[model samples]
Target chain A: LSDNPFDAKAWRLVDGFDDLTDITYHRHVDDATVRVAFNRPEVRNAFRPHTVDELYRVLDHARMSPDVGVVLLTGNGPSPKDGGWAFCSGGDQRRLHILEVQRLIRFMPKVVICLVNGWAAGGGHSLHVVCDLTLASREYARFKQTDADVGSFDGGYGSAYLARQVGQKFAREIFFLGRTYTAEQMHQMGAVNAVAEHAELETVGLQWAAEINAKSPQAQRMLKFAFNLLDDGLVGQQLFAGEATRLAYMTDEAVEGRDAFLRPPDWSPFPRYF
Target chain B: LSDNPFDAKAWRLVDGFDDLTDITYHRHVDDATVRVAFNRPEVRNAFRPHTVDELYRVLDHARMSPDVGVVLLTGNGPSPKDGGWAFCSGGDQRRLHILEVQRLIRFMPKVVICLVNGWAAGGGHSLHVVCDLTLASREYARFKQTDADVGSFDGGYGSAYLARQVGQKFAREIFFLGRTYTAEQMHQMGAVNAVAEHAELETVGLQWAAEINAKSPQAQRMLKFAFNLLDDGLVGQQLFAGEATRLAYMTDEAVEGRDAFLRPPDWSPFPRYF
Candidate 1:
């Protein structure tokens, strides 16, 4: 399953793993958390369908594995948008078109940290908006929803639903007008919880993740589920009926995800996503 | 000459009172303030062709009335959207198909405030949004600019018309959403200065009018005039030319306004408006 069989150094971490999908979670150094960065710089850390699937795969592993509690999601090198280091570009549109109800089992990474040190637009915004809370540098992050170009506002192929992030009317406007906002403006709208100076994202995100991870796991997860559920009436109705578990785990990706959780994090999709 | 000639009380209090054209501008209670209400509650206060004309006349009086220091424009009675008292709605598409620019005088109502008591919908929104500020009653007021129906965003009337009350996005969201929101939401939006109990609208409105009227005269007029020029733009552009009158007194209402200013602040429109 390794998309790139070469890149020996980048792929070096997975020698003992059976398959890329079997990889459990892994971590690198930082004070309070592990820094999981999407390595493609020119695309501003944009993702594909495989990358999105891998995200939840790593998240499930992180959840199952006892070693870690929180994650510090960032970027590799520098970015022109905010002097380097951005989390993502836009949602993977091509794969997004093929999504169905069974694809939701992928949100396993429990909690997410978005350290936007650079420009973020389109699909990259999908993850940023879905995270519990976001923090970014003063240089600002841009958000736009182009899926209206898809004709339906439905949570299409995991492009990150609009009704969930931006409310109805304004959500529709985001696509019709194709507008973008800076990180500071977003923080005020209750989109992101904080905005850091150019040099502070790493320190700030790690500190926040540690504080959250220290809480009771069951309670934190329950609260997050409730909060997210309350905001999205559509999602709430589906999950409240009790059939959600049966439906979600039945998906092919859910099975793949379960298997992926057993091995270490993989580089098949990208070094950072898995 | 009274717009509603049957009412002698309205006539005796204000001289030269006429519904000259389609619009009606008159006094209802005191010497200062003017009241311009959407009389078409049968359609839930929706604006028709004559509504815009009436608004233009009221705006003219608001600028020219010697006794006028404040104006309160709102819908009559209670409404289902909230408790009662409607503020204003978006453009009346049924009428915008033929809206004109001639009767439209430059809008610069220094202390125009709406008593959003019940429900305000359709083109009813422009009046509230265009006003400098508003005083709404809890459940008695709602601010929804859901432009989805219109499929457009034209906030021109409120460009320099409103202060940077809730910042940019909040304003955009309110206007675009088109859904009716409560007076509490209005206050949170900074759309209205305060949300009073419906029964207390007049008391609160009047007190605020007197407060502004009691201020130093020169300071009152100049500050209001200057505020409009610098509402949202940066300080440099606002303070540029350091107090130039080129932009001052250039409005069509400015002519009648200057004459009305030097007169006693106890006469007609203020009572009607407040």
Candidate 2:
């Protein structure tokens, strides 16, 4: 499975990008995977407010599109000045538009995969931490929580949710020490799910996306919500509850209720689920 | 660290156990660690209503004790009838009291560690899953989720919190497949924190307890509540909030407010924490 070659032909760029900057969105031609890449390579793909706005727009599109089941989030890298690759350098020393994007990555009812090719630092590290799963380039990808050095912090999902991904001790170390960790190290710490060679990063990500897309969408959606139900608090509970209600609405019992309201009631057609 | 020997002399049984049965409670004479053991080895320590009651009483004692900082939870094993060991076989085909014990394991302001000497199955498995940390006997410890086979399941923390510990896929596998897992496997899956030889389980557990006891009790308390804040829902949030409020009340600012009500205020005495 790791030997699979990258197939650029499998993806086709989605139209209506004339208004977009700082990001490019594409859809898999043969599957339900949607790929969204950070386009700012000059500053190691650092995101500004405009970048966050574009991300929100594209992510919303992915969530609303019925056929899209998996999202691949990456960055255009290899800085023009330093020639270094980066998944993201976090915010461009400028930033709430990003917080909503983080929320979208989490509660979208689909599998969101962070494909990290290089530096996933600061806000970028937290972004991947919130995603359902992460795949990183073995040699190029490095992670750091730069909040402490920058005199800023993400007290919510970035720290608390991060502690959920990596244990509390390591999460604290990452934030307090502000150290860079390799992809393999992040994988060992449970922050990144898997790592591949730099060249195979996208291939492995697509493979994972294909596998996820083959599973039950409703089950995946429910599972996504279930995974976040604990840390997201009441809002997370509401999301899970909404998903359960959506499933309930698909049942014959719900159909009977709706029909009964419109015409007449029949209680004998459906057996009790419990 | 793994080479440490069990020192029974370090622990002294807390007084007032003349009426107890099904469990034994002890406290370290040298430190703030409390050890609670399930004592019903006759039935592989399978807790009945009585066992759960004993657990609640002992666990509460551990929580309320002024000097207590760490809790070590284990089960007596090597059932004479079967010549097999078990951390616990779960409830004795009988069972809310256990849920309260689980809650105490989570919400108590002290660190709770589960020491698995043998089989940790069914409710026994869930018991350890809710703990702050777990240490298991490498050669003897095994884990299994028997809910599917037993015509019962833990829809709340057992399923949801388990996902937080081991991710969604494996959590489902443990629940749906009803399979046995080794200590190393559970460790790899991020369930058990560490494993030791059968003879060294208690030694390692005590070592961990001693180490934890040396840390800041207030910091540990806050961290415990923060770690659990995500999954416990509103109740979990309230626990964390209560801890924060408790800390707040310790401040001179809070004292000044109280002093103002009683006599006169002196707000200039304390600087803002933030």
Candidate 3:
């Protein structure tokens, strides 16, 4: 019933980093908003391990919250000096990093909005991608894709996630070649539902959310489910397989491919490129 | 790896008359093209349940063939003769037909292409939608979705699939209404990849095959796997759920959603029209 049970530090982490951190979270209702965020913006909204555990916990909690119609994921800013992760979907996909990249995905039967206000990178990018929808800004307070994670191999699995939202080839090229793309690019890829001028992100993004909020939460969730299946399942598989097959082909095709490479045919096409 | 293997007759099914049988399939390696032809061009390429298995086999065997860079699933006659398959991809969605229809999908490492030589009806529509790509004649043939097989909702899945490729929503409407659509409309899909005059189907279809043939076979297979996966696993559950939900909403949702939004206004717009 209580929207924000600001027991502030009462929220406990279900799964997260333990060393050197203070963070907390708790359960709330589902009128469509989840009680979650980074408290220590003084450290630039850095998420301690407990913060992450709390995040995953919150997501699990959201699944059944009667008042939670929406889950708004946000991070505060200690003047952009945020330490450790506060929210990263792919945070668990790898080890060693300590911050909590909470995927607090819960009975988000309504809307899941990731609002990027401060500069977000690495783990931050993972959160935006995991959510049903994301909104970012044009300035430093933006969602950033890190090559630090991908480094090579056509933008790594990271690009693959986006490629599905857009096209396989486009995702491949962007991850492989794009040093830095903008919020606009993210919008075009269908990742962030919308991207706004640096200052207007909240205005425009929330306006869109308001429109969504008006719809039936049940309808919204079901719609999102169907979309996720197609976009994230069938299509997602090809995006994954696309790069993997390329990797597989190299080692397996030596005999035939090698022979063709070595042989040169003098024959010219009847209808040439001209 | 050994690319060529003989004896593919078992895989190919011959439909119709005892002597010539109405339809027959030839599966072989190195040939690279697995064909579906109407032995009785005199009858127009008709199809039966057996046709489904035969076509499925052609697709499966050709797809699996290491030597097969691309497979051609086409009809031989100037007009599709046998029972009524017509050409590639048109069947309806009766529970019985759809089950058999789905069986034809084979993601053989090689690219799958189809030659739409003549009349392609409801069941025939599958040929166009299932293959990774398709080639057809603009003026040469006629296409319709009136057949029971196509009118069935099974084709709805095909519509969704084609929409992804052609990058448009137009085809979906046709399937939604079970109306007849034109070749030009398919051209609009852009997913068609190539179009030809009826006379040019074989020549053009084969040429497209050759073009694909030039690519690494191993790469094609791998690429196919990747391409196939892109939309299946990652988000399939959600998309289907969305579809099911939408249909349910249309049926439920307070007499077409009018009931839910009827609050005494901070009023919105469905303003009094003239």
Ranking by lDDT: 2, 1, 3
Task: List the candidate 2 regions with Cα displacement exceeding 4 Å.
Answer: A1-8, B1-274
lDDT of 1 by residue, A1-274 (tens): 3222112232123123234441123353433344455655545666666655565555545455555656655554344455444456654332331121012222232566667666666555555655566787776455655433322222321232444455566555665665766778767655667888765666677679778878886566556555544533322322222233334445554454445543432324423325
Q: Write the per-residue lDDT of candidate 3 for residues A8-113, one digit (tens) a residue.
A: 3423433333432433333332223443555555554545555565555555566656665666666543333533322332222212112112212411345677
Pitting candidate 1 against candidate 3, the one with the higher DockQ is: 3
Overall lDDT per candidate, in order of appearance: 0.50, 0.78, 0.49
Higher-scoring candidate on lDDT, 2 or 3: 2
**Superior candidate under lDDT, 1 versus 3:** 1
Positional deviation of residue B228's Cα in model 2 after best superposition, in angstroms: 16
**TM-score per candidate, chains pooled:** 0.38, 0.51, 0.38
Q: Among these predicted structures, which one has the highest DockQ? A: 3
Q: Please state the error at residue B166 of candidate 1 in Å.
A: 1.3
| lDDT for each residue of candidate 2 in A155-181, tens digit (9 for 90 to 100) | 656777778888999999999998999
Note the residue pairs that clash in candidate 2.
Answer: A230-B230
lDDT (tens digit, per residue) of candidate 2 on B1-274: 3332245677798888757899988888887888888888777788898889888988988887998888889877667688677888786752534765776687688889999988888778888988899999888888988754544456555666788989999999999997999999999999989989887888788889888888888888888877776666544554565566556656667655545543555656666568
Model 2 Cα displacement at B273 (Å)?
4.2
